[PDB]
């Protein structure tokens, strides 16, 4: 289960980075920090809370049209 969290954190940071999020230094520092904690986590719960904290960054933006990319 945790491996899914690590892989999706890698993908999330990839999409965020290509979303020109590294042009705001504090934002990029927070994102990189959270990524490195997720990758070095040993239990699944704090991984998930850091995961949702990281996802909130992408959610706050308005570049990824969400109702489309969730076509199910």
């Amino acid at each position: 289960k945790m491996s899914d969290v690590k892989c999706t954190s890698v993908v999330l940071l990839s999409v965020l980075q290509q979303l020109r999020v590294e042009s705001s230094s504090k934002l990029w520092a927070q994102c990189v920090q959270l990524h490195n904690d997720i990758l070095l986590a040993k239990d699944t719960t704090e991984a998930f809370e850091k995961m949702v904290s990281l996802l909130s960054v992408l959610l706050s933006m308005q570049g990824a049209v969400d109702i489309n990319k969730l076509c199910e």
Binding site: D4, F48, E49, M51, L59, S60, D66, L70
Partner: protein, 186 residues
């Protein structure tokens, strides 16, 4: 490779030698067909060698350029494939804490900061309508990210503080609806 012109000549020579060895008549008359048949495999395996290597040459070059075409078409679409792959993995993940905020953002509750994780610390969640208010905020408690927050500073879009008891259905079309409802974690 049998559809080459030299194969016909080789076949005629082979038939001639088969007839000769089936008759076994002379010593030199058949030896003619070692000066005319041993040659017949000289303009045959010289013409049927180069074409066979040409076939694999063409195949290897075609594969190389197909791979180059695929490589140029892949690195030019990354910023759609990354998002598709991400959302497929997310819906595979199946965690309620995620689904809550994903649905909420799908209808409008986009937070205006990083969701804090400490028991303290502040959160601000845009709410653009009233039906959205019905599900999330009830009284004084704010339900979001599968957590329990405390409502404190409802405000309209023209930067005017709007009280909590004012929020109701009939008087809802009286406010700048993009509310920014600041709260704190349990």
């Amino acid at each position: 490779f049998s559809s080459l012109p030299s194969y016909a000549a080789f076949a005629t020579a082979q038939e001639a030698y088969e007839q000769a060895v089936a008759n076994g008549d002379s010593e030199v008359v058949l030896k003619k067909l070692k000066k005319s048949l041993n040659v017949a495999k000289s303009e045959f395996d010289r013409d049927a060698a180069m074409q066979r290597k040409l076939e694999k040459m063409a195949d290897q070059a075609m594969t190389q350029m197909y791979k180059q075409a695929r490589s140029e078409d892949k690195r030019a679409k990354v910023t759609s494939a990354m998002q598709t792959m991400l959302f497929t993995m997310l819906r595979k993940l199946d965690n309620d804490a995620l689904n809550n905020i994903i649905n909420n953002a799908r209808d409008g509750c986009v937070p205006l900061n990083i969701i804090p994780l400490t028991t303290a610390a502040k959160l601000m969640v845009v709410i653009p309508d009233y039906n959205t208010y019905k599900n999330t905020c009830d009284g004084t408690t704010f339900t979001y990210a599968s957590a329990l927050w405390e409502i404190q500073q409802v405000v309209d879009a023209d930067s005017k503080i709007v009280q909590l008891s004012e929020i109701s259905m009939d008087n809802s079309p009286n406010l700048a609806w993009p509310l920014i409802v600041t709260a704190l974690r349990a």
